[PDB]
Structures are given as structure tokens and as C-alpha cells.
From a paper:
In this process, small GTPase Rab5 functions as a master regulator of the early endosomal biogenesis. Rabex-5 is a specific GEF for Rab5, Rab17, and Rab21. Rabaptin-5 is a key effector of Rab5 and plays an important role in both homotypic and heterotypic fusions of early endosomes. The GEF activity of Rabex-5 is autoinhibited by its CC domain and is activated by the binding of Rabaptin-5 via its C2-1 domain.
The asymmetric unit contains two Rab5-Rabex-5Δ-Rabaptin-5C212 complexes related by a twofold non-crystallographic symmetry. However, in the R3Δ complex, Rabaptin-5C212 adopts a linear conformation and the Rabex-5 GEF domain is displaced with a completely exposed substrate-binding site. Indeed, in the structure of the R3Δ complex, although Rabex-5CC still forms a tight three-helix bundle with the C-terminal regions of Rabaptin-5C212, Rabaptin-5C212 forms a linear two-helix bundle which is different from the V-shaped conformation but similar to that in the Rabex-5CC-Rabaptin-5C212 complex and the GAT-Rabaptin-5C212 complex. The GEF domain is dislodged from the three-helix bundle and interacts with the N-terminal regions of Rabaptin-5C212, and the substrate-binding site is completely exposed to bind Rab5. The GEF domain of Rabex-5 interacts via a small portion of the opposite side of the substrate-binding site with a small portion of the N-terminal regions of Rabaptin-5C212. The overall structure of the nucleotide-free Rab5 differs from the nucleotide-bound Rab5 in the conformations of the P-loop and the switch regions. Nevertheless, the interactions between Rabex-5 and Rab5 are similar to those between Rabex-5 and Rab21, suggesting that Rabex-5 may activate Rab5 via a similar mechanism as for Rab21. Moreover, in the R3Δ structure, Rabaptin-5C212 also assumes a linear conformation but two Rabaptin-5C212 dimerize through the middle regions (residues 590–600) between the GAT-binding site and the Rabex-5CC-binding site. The binding of the GDP-bound Rab5 to Rabex-5 induces further conformational changes of the Rabex-5-Rabaptin-5 complex such that Rabaptin-5C212 transforms from the V-shaped to the linear conformation, the GEF domain is dislodged from Rabex-5CC and the C-terminal regions of Rabaptin-5C212, and the substrate-binding site is completely exposed to the solvent to bind Rab5 as observed in the R3Δ structure (State III). Similarly, the theoretical scattering curve calculated from the R3Δ model fits well with the experimental SAXS data for both R3 and R3Δ complexes (goodness of fit χ = 0.68 and 0.96, respectively), and the theoretical P(r) distribution of the R3Δ model is also in good agreement with the experimental P(r) distributions of both R3 and R3Δ complexes. These results indicate that the R3 and R3Δ complexes assume mainly the linear conformation as observed in the R3Δ structure in solution.
Residue numbers in the entry:
A (entry chain C): 552 to 634
B (entry chain D): 558 to 632
C (entry chain G): 552 to 635
D (entry chain H): 553 to 634
E (entry chain E): 134 to 309, 318 to 437
F (entry chain A): 134 to 198, 200 to 437
G (entry chain B): 20 to 40, 51 to 182
H (entry chain F): 21 to 25, 34 to 41, 53 to 60, 70 to 88, 93 to 101, 104 to 133, 141 to 156, 158 to 182
The structure:
Amino acid sequence: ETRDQVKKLQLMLRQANDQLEKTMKDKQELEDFIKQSSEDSSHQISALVLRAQASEILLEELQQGLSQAKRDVQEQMAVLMQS
Amino acid sequence: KKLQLMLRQANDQLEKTMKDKQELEDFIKQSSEDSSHQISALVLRAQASEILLEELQQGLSQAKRDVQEQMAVLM
Amino acid sequence: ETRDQVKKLQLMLRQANDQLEKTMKDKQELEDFIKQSSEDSSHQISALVLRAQASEILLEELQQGLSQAKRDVQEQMAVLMQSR
Amino acid sequence: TRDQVKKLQLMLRQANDQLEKTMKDKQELEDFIKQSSEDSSHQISALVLRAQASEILLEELQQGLSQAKRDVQEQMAVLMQS
Amino acid sequence: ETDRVSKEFIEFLKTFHKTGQEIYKQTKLFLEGMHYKRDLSIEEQSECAQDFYHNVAERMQTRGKVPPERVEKIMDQIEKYIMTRLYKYVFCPETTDDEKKDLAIQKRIRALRWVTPQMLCVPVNEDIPEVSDMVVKAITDIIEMDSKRVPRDKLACITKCSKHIFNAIKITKNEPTLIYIVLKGNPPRLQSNIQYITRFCNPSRLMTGEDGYYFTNLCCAVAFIEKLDAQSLNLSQEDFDRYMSGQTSPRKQMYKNLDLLSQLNERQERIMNEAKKLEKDLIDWTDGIAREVQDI
Amino acid sequence: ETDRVSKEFIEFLKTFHKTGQEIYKQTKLFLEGMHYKRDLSIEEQSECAQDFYHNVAERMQTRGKPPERVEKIMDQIEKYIMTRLYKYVFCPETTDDEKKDLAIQKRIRALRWVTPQMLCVPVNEDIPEVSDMVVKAITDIIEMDSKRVPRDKLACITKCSKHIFNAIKITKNEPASADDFLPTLIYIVLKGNPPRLQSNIQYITRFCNPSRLMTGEDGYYFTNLCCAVAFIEKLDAQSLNLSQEDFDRYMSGQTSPRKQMYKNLDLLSQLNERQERIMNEAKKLEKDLIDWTDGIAREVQDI
Amino acid sequence: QFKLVLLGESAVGKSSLVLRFSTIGAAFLTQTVCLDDTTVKFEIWDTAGQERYHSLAPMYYRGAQAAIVVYDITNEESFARAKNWVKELQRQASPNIVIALSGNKADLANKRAVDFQEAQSYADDNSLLFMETSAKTSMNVNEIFMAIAKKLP
Amino acid sequence: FKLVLSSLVLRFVIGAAFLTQKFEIWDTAGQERYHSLAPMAQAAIVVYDNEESFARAKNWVKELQRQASPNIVIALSGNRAVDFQEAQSYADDNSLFMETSAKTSMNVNEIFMAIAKKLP
């Protein structure tokens, strides 16, 4: 019985070590995954909205600017209309 | 005999390392969740800034038709 | 009749001219305002998130980073029971 | 007379079309800032949320160490004995 | 102005070599009439013109014997020549309240900017890029009607509009409203446009043509909104009064948002640093526990 | 710490030249017993604990003889025991405590998606202070495990629920009913993933003086607490006012790990590509526009 | 001591009425009253007016010695909620319990939807304490309270 | 002529409201809210399915008989919970009426082809 206890014990230990060894890999890997990952989340996201609000607005200068060129050019037909 | 103690040892350190990993996990799901809700809200703004943009592009391409019909009306 | 009329017309035209004037100042200012608003909205906002999703990590690698460092000294006191 | 009022009523009519457009214009730009402010808005709190959660993780952490300096100190207090 | 169109029509009526003259002179006759009446009172301005409607329509048919299958299209071309010269004269007459009630609408709508559709329970969901993609145009087609002087292009703007409107129903519910599109749009120079239609639209185009049904239900929606009340919403006055106090507060959200921000940077700048302190304050344990034992 | 209370406790009873001894030796006798009995049925464990509580409670009145005063002693006595005893009595190996402690830890772990739009909690965390006391209630339920004794514990319960009422009041400015309250604390627990949660609770239920639990401030808090909790395990879409669709949805195709950042990572490149697109198109009419205006200006300015 | 529980439908003043009975937030009360030289003190459980958490009441009330069910008079629904609360009460709450019900928001009764004689009818049909109350004018409050108190041993 | 009225006019003839057959037919909104301001018509109908539909049809014909121009002809549509004998007693008390089914297209062609030959 003693020696059976010793095989089954050698099984639990070898198997468990390949497995521990696995988890230390997966884990340490993974932190490396997210570190750089949330870096890309971040860096990108900021560079991104900076484009939104620096750009999505750039257009109402037009939102108003078209309505002016529509009022002045509707006017030129009036600058001609007395002529 | 001695194998059973070293095996207790073969377990516990792993179970600890299991903590380290499992925490990391909950975490990235969540930074990830949060990011998520932001990117959905960001897309949502971007494409609106696009709608007013085709809205205007066509509105000028029409106003050229407007000046062409009206200056056709005056000469 | 004209003497009744012309008062009222010089009236609406004057009031309303001052009114145009209101709405004119108001818009040009309000817009100048918002252009600024996106600016101090963004520069800060990104300088906020960007520090954030990358700064709130530091605490994460520390929560995980303790448990082996606690394991280090916990293992370290084990060297002592033999030194007895 | 008809110069004094007809042509005047026309001048008013146009100055009025005119206010109309500028009023339209402002309220458009204005409605807009309300929208940019809205979409910033729903988000800004989710922006707070990661901040304070990652304020909490730091207080619980500062706390657990505030425990472990006490623990290794008591444990080395158990070692100093004969 | 007077030249070129003088040409397009003289080119136009001679095609018959029969009826070509009759229309021309009758026209310039009632024309001098209505331009004489340009200074005459407004209600008094429309009359010999709609008279001219019914009167031409009858005068030509009894004597002329021409197939009306093509008249379906004749209803269209006629309005251009008249409205071009007359716009200056009859659009927003100084005699009327047109300008004034245009401002009634502009102000009212602006003041209603706080209302949302879920209370009307209109059969839409604008969340979809598509239904709202047509929401935008829905808003713009009713707008451009004012850009064009003629009632043809105008009623074409109304019709095209009413048409791209139920499709939001077809994208969201998928079943084959009025109040919702106008109220977000705030349409320019409305009353004198509306009326430009009333006086100078073809009464028949109001009877048979779709533009008629569209237009009719529109003014229903308009006169509805003008006195729009609590009971068409089914909501109480205690809060209602609050809503009449005014929610205008425009720059305000951004003002408040913009306050918070720097205390929040203040929150995280109020973080990184102690964690950086806790970096150092940390190893000093680990190394400290290291040095003191490395002795023995 | 198994070291230290031996001093503090004595410092308390030393004023008594009469009953101090009278209770003390009496206690440590059967208490000496409980180290031997550590192997007996757990139910029997809390049993001779609740017995010894109640028994001194009668006996002192029998020989030594006011209940106005008891609530204040009830802390100290149990303090001395739990200091040596926590180790034997927390989360029994014989019991399922450990098991449901992890069941719940995962249960709440999966709760990362929650907003009080679903629950309608009457709080607004946007104000710095409000979130500061929010954080504190959480810091309290976290710190709840730290305490070896259940008095310090029950005080973390109270104190937490207190930082919750506080935020309730600053956010509302009307105080809170439990219409305005339960979903709050749940909002805090949900945010706590609280440690050794289950076995802490049961350590209390089984080990603490029941009167300080029935009469004391602590009773209502711990109660509505466990309620909030065992409710959280048994949860309804229709109690969230949610269809079976969302209820299944947020947990059904998700919880695949790390994928979320991947998806987010794809998306993110998609959008930034789009805003580069829109911008450069508006630049197309930056130019393509003016040439109409000045073009209708100059090309027509001729005659 | 003496244990009582408070149940109701939400915002019905489940909040309010006790509150009037400004430093902290609205907890359980622990109020001391005596109609005699001997003193009786109270314990009071604030419970979910919110309807989905209307599910867990069992342990709130378990060891408790008294009880209360709130219904609004301008919302007959809160009154029906009240009736079901009663049937549940007599059945699965420790039948040792003592009962009392009232209609509230008695300040705006130009808006009243729940009939006095009807609710007193349903009350006195199951032998209930019934005199309706207001929190704003505070009418039968302490009255309905000494009424409460003449019952406990 | 102009007729004033979801699925029953769908079996007979893009837009839900207007359908040209001249049958110039206009369609009403299912909501109870904006009920007034109805009149522009020389023909009219009234539709019910729920006994509330019946009731609304009652106050609806009670709006119609009073307000309109005198000439217009009306027609009623069933679309169980109510006796037909009741509906028909009501209908003949006030003088064309029928029950209709569009999935089989029962009286779908009919009510229109009977409304047409009525108008002078």
C-alpha cells in the first residue's frame, strides 16, 4: 500500500507542477496583455476624442457659414434686380 | 511519508497564484466593460456629426440649383 | 391717419433694429464661447482619461504585486525555523 | 402718404425676415451645444465611475498592508523568544 | 426678368396657333388688374385672381373642346410665370399679419423645445441609423419649400416631405407623427408660405392631388400646436408651470460639466501620487525586512 | 492578537473587588472546555455559546444583581472570547460556509454590469462628497472582514449603512424610506464583492449577543443586509423591470474573458478611421464650398 | 422592548409620516412612550415601498411584536396593495401580531379616491384599528399611537 | 368625392392614410387624444371591433350628425363581446351598416361599392 501511495503521490505532484507552471505563465502573460492593451485603449481613445471635439465642431462654422452664403448670394440677385 | 507535506505545498502556492490570476481577470472584464460603454457612446456621436454633414453637402448642391433657377429667372 | 401710422412704423422698425442688434451680439459671443468649450472640454478630458485608464493600472499591478511580495517574506521567515 | 408707409412696411417686412433667419441661426447653434453637452453628459459619470472604483482599490490595498506590517511585526515578536 | 420669360411663354403659346393669343391678352389684362390691386387690400388682392381660376377653367372648356388628359400636367406650368413677378408683391403682404404670425410660430416652437415624442407615443424609434437618417431629410424637405417662389416646387416640397415621413414607422414598427416632425424642425417664414399656398395653390390640387390631403392634415397639426395645451398631452399643471418658468439654461450644462472636470482631474491627480508614494513606502518594507534579516 | 486581549480585558474588570473574579473563573472553565469541544457539532458550538451567554445573564442577577446598563458590557465580554476563538470558529471546514462564500463571490463577480437605472436607487454619485461617502460605505464593508470580533463587525455594518444613509440624504435632501434605501445598500454590496462575505455573516448570526442584535441599532442593518443579499442570489428580470431578453443577454454571450477588450480594440480602430473620414470630407467642402460663394461672386461680378 | 414593522407601497408617504413623527437620514425609530409609570419602548422596520423587493419581508418582521400597512387614499392601488398585505399578514406573519391601517395624504383630500366608510368597513370587518391619519397636519398620529399602545402586555 | 375613415382599407385598395381607387380616401389616427378639429367631405364611415370601440363609435357618430354639412352619407363597420342585435338596433334607430372580415376579404369590396352608388 505504501508504495501505491507513492506512485499516486508522484502523479499529483508532477501533474500539479506542470499545472502551476502553466498558471504562472498564463497570468504573468496576461498582465502583460492588459498593460499594453489599456495603453492602447487609452492613448488611442484620447487621440480619438481629441479628434471628435476638435473636429465635429469644425463644421458648425459651416452650419452657420452656409446660412450666411445663402443669405448674401440670395441677395446678389437683388443687387442685380434694380439694374 | 514526507511526500504528503511537500504535496500540501504543491497545492497551496498554486491556490494563491490562482488568486492573483482570478483578480486580474475580474478586472480586465470591467475596465473592458467601461471602455465598452464609452466606445458605444463615442460612435454614437461621431456618426451624428456625419449626418449633418451629408445634410449640408446636399444642401449646398441644391443651393446651386437654386441660384441657377433664379438667375435663369432674372436675365 | 398718416400721423398716427408713421409713429407706429418708426416704432417697430427701431425696436426691432435694436433687437437684431441683441440677437447679433448674442450669437457671435455664444458661439465663440462654445468653440472655447470644446477646447477646454477635450484637452482636459483626454488628459483626463488618458492619464486614467493608464493610471488606475498602477494600483492593479500593486494589488497583484503584493501577494508574491508577501509570499517573499512569508517564505523568508521559513528560512528562520531551520536557523533555530 | 404711400411713400411714407408702403415702402416703410416693406422695409420692416424684410428687416423682419431678417431677424427671423438670425434667430433661427442662433437657436440652431444653441440647440447644438445643448446636444454636445448631453452626449458628454451621459458619459462623464461612467468617467467618474472607473476613477472612484480605482480609488477604492487603493484604500482597501493601503489597508491590507497596514495590516501586514502589523502581522510580520507580531510574528517576529513570536520569534525573539528562547 | 421681364425679357426672358416673355420669351419662354411666347415660345410656349404659339404652339397651338389657335389658343395662343387668347390666353396671352386675357392674362396681361387681369395682370394689370392685380398689379393695380397690389396696393389694394390683401383679401381684396386674391379675388379677381381666384375668380380668374374658376373663370379660365370654365371659359376654355365650353368653347375649346380639348382633351383634359394632358391638363393633368397643364395645372403645373401655369403658376411659374405669375408667381415670379408677383412674389415681390404678394408674398408676405404688408397689409397682412403674415410676417407677424410667422414670428408667432417661430417663437412658439422655440419655446416648446423641451418636449419629446414618447409622450405623443409617435410610432418611431430614431435610435436606428436608418429611420433617423430619413428623420434628417424629413426635417429638410419641409424647409426648402420656402427657397422656391412657385407653388409647384413648394407643394412638391410638402408632398415629398409627407412621404419620407411615415417610413420611420416602416423602419421601427414596420407598419405603413405630423406634430413630431414639424415641432423639431421650426420651419421658416411659415404663415405667409402657408397662406401663399391658401391663396395661390390650385384648389383642385387640394381636392384630387395628394398634396391636398397632405396639406390639409398639416394645417390641422398647425392650428393644433398654436394653442397646444396640457389636455392634448394628458399631463398635470403643478410641474407644467415649472416647465413654463423656463428650462432655457443653454450654456449651462457645459458650464456645470466644465466645473466638475478639474476636481476630477483633481481626484486622479489626487491618486497616482500616493500610489507612487505607496510604491516607495512599499519596497521599504520588503528591502527593510531584507536588510534586517540579511544580517542574520 | 491572540496575545494582546488578555491585558485589555483585565484592565476593564479590575475596578471590581467583588464580581470580577466571580464571573472570570466561571467563564474560563467551560471555555477551557470549548477547545476540547472544537470537534463537536457546530450547531452544538453556537449552542453552548448562546447558553453561556444567557446563563451568565441569569446567574449574575441571581447572586450579584440593571438592564439599562447591559448593552454596554455585551461588547467587551464576547470580545475576549472571539480573540482566541475566531480561528476555531470562522468558516468551519466541516461546513459549507467556504462553498457559498465562493458561490456568492462569483455571483457578485458576475454583477459588473449594474446601474441604478435598473434599480432606480435614489442616489446621485456625481457630487464629489457623495461619492466620497459612497466609497466609505464600501470601505466599511470591505473592512467588515478585518474585524476579529463581531461588535467591531456589527459596527462596520452599521457604519456602512450609515455612510449609505448619508449619501442618501445628500443626494436626495429628503431622508430615505427603504423604498429609497434597500437598492442603495445593494448598490454598495454589489460594488463590494465583499470578502469572506458569507462566512462573516454566519459567524455573526451564530456568534454574537442576540439582544444587541434585536434591540441595538445593528439589528435593522444586518437584517435588511442579509435580505438584500439572499435576494441578490435569487434575481428577477421582471423584478428589475427587464425582459427575459436582457436578463439572459448580459450574461449569456459574454463572460468570455479578455474578448471584450479585443472587441473594444477593433471598434476603436473603426471609429478613428471614420472621424478621419468625416473630417477630411468637411475639408472637401471647406474648399468645395467657398468657390461657389466667391465663384458666384467673381465669375458673375463681370457685367 | 417591543418590536414593530413598517410596510407599504412606495412614495405613498411610506417615507413621510414617520419622518414628521432635520439631522440624519430616515432609519428605524426606537421611540420611547409611556401612558403609565412603566415604560414601553418601540422598534420599527422601514421596508421596501418599491414593489419588486416587496418579496423578502419574512425576516424583517420575523421576531417583531407589532406591525403597520400603508395605503394612500388618492391611489386606490395602494389600498389594494394594503389588503393583500393584510391577508399575507394574518396568514404567514406570526399570528401573535397586532394590526392597524390608515389612509394618508389627508391634506389634499379634494383629490381623495378612497372612501372613508368603505375602508373602515373592510377594517372593522376583520376587527382592525381604523381612524385615518395625516402627516402634514399630524392628526390622529400620536392618538392612533396611544391607540397602538393600549394593546401590548 | 372625399371619404373620411388599419387593415380593412388595406384589403380593399406605402402610405397608410391615402389610397386612390374616384375613391379619395383619408385615414384617422388610432389615438384618442387629438380627437377634435376633424371636418375638412361628402362621404363618411365609422369603425369598431372590445366594446370601447363601440362606445367611441357612438360619441363619434354623435360628433358627426351634429357638426357636418347636411348631405354626407355614413357607413358602419364591425371588425362575441357584443350582440349584433344590439348594434343593429342602434344602427336602424339612426338609419348603411355591416360586419366585415378582410383576411378572407368578406365584405371588403362590398361596403365601398355600396358607399359609391349612394353618393348623388
